[PDB]
Design a protein around this ligand. Structure first.
Ligand SMILES: NC(=O)c1ccc[n+]([C@@H]2O[C@H](COP(=O)([O-])OP(=O)(O)OC[C@H]3O[C@@H](n4cnc5c(N)ncnc54)[C@H](OP(=O)(O)O)[C@@H]3O)[C@@H](O)[C@H]2O)c1
Ligand SMILES: O=P(O)(O)OC[C@H]1O[C@@H](O)[C@H](O)[C@@H](O)[C@@H]1O
Length: 315
């Protein structure tokens, strides 16, 4: 239960450490602490601008022999400005460089939406809108498949894909490698029952991101819902003598999901690990599910008119 079996035969640790918003000056210590504490799965991305510093931590713990490379499960993601078939290998290689590794365990397409290649992560026109690429999902998928054949990555997957977009890849003529993982937003306010049931029926593992509601998202507001401070969730935690964070992390785990909470605080990274040793009742689970309000932290709102925008479909 500490690891789930992927369709490529590998085993993915059900708990991982997230690194979006982890400042460069703090994330090396954060990752060293996590590995020491017993984390074996780190979620990364080129767009987080801190992979070099994550890589410093991974190298220090490998050199120290705290972990063997084979025990670690390192994830990164292909950013939207590199969807072109000819840019994919290079994007993967730059991430490998920064992280100081010679293969990734899992490489995800970060969003289904391709943007204009360039130095800008969000290329804008003079009208301030995001300039798309004309690339499609299937071509980018074909490029990702040959990363597997080249030995650069062990498995490939997708992130923020809706079920029709997953369908598209699954029905691709001559599909060689299925998506191993779809990483999506999921917590009590966005429970994702339909999509999770869809992916799990197709043998695709689901990873829940922003499990605590991403209280540090740069676009946060005061009137905004807060999971960590929902009295109903505080109550379920009190009953178990756990923290509301530990309840919010255990919740996806009991849905057979992988979950990747972010912290750069050593006490919280430790607190977040102690979630293997208790059980939410079925009443707790059904209750937590009933809190769904279809509320999204990450709606990629600047791309709502992109041909590949994922969140117009029901699921
Ligand atoms: N695929 C995608 O498009 C996508 C999108 C969003 C997220 N993700 C991944 O999912 C990871 C997690 O999502 P996220 O960063 O949005 O947020 P999250 O994990 O839901 O929340 C992180 C926030 O919770 C705080 N926190 C962590 N543990 C806590 C605890 N024990 N008690 C109180 N506060 C706690 C953290 O503070 P401190 O850090 O100060 O402790 C941080 O401010 C990301 O870092 C990224 O790796 C992927
Ligand atoms: O950074 P992620 O949430 O993993 O997804 C990628 C992008 O989407 C949102 O978060 C913002 O527009 C940026 O902070 C980021 O460049």
């Amino acid at each position: 239960a500490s690891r789930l079996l992927l369709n490529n035969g590998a085993k993915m640790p059900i708990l991982g450490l997230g690194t979006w918003k982890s400042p460069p000056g703090q994330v090396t210590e954060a990752v060293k602490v996590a590995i020491d504490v017993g984390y074996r799965h780190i979620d990364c991305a080129h767009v987080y601008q801190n992979e070099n510093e994550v890589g410093v931590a991974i190298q220090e713990k490998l050199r120290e022999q705290v972990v063997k490379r084979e025990e670690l499960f390192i994830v990164s993601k292909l950013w939207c400005t590199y969807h072109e078939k000819g840019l994919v290998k290079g994007a993967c290689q730059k991430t490998l460089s920064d992280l100081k590794l010679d293969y990734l365990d899992l490489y995800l397409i970060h969003w289904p939406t391709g943007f204009k290649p360039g130095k800008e992560f969000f290329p804008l026109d003079e009208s301030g809108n995001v300039v798309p690429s004309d690339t499609n999902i299937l071509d980018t998928w074909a490029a990702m498949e040959e990363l597997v054949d080249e030995g650069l990555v062990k498995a490939i997957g997708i992130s923020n894909f809706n079920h029709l977009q997953v369908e598209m890849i699954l029905n691709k003529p001559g599909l060689k490698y299925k998506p191993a993982v779809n990483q999506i937003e999921c917590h009590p306010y966005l429970t994702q029952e339909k999509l999770i049931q869809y992916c799990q029926s197709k043998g695709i593992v689901v990873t829940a991101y922003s499990p605590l509601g991403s209280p540090d998202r740069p676009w946060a507001k005061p009137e905004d819902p807060s999971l960590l401070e929902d009295p109903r969730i505080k109550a379920i935690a009190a009953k178990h003598n756990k923290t509301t964070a530990q309840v919010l992390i255990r919740f996806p785990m009991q849905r057979n999901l992988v979950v990747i909470p972010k912290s750069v605080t050593p006490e919280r990274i430790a607190e977040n690990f102690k979630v293997f040793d208790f059980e939410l009742s079925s009443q707790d689970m059904t209750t937590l599910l009933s809190y769904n309000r279809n509320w999204r932290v990450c709606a990629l709102l600047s791309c709502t008119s992109h041909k590949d925008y994922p969140f117009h479909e029901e699921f």
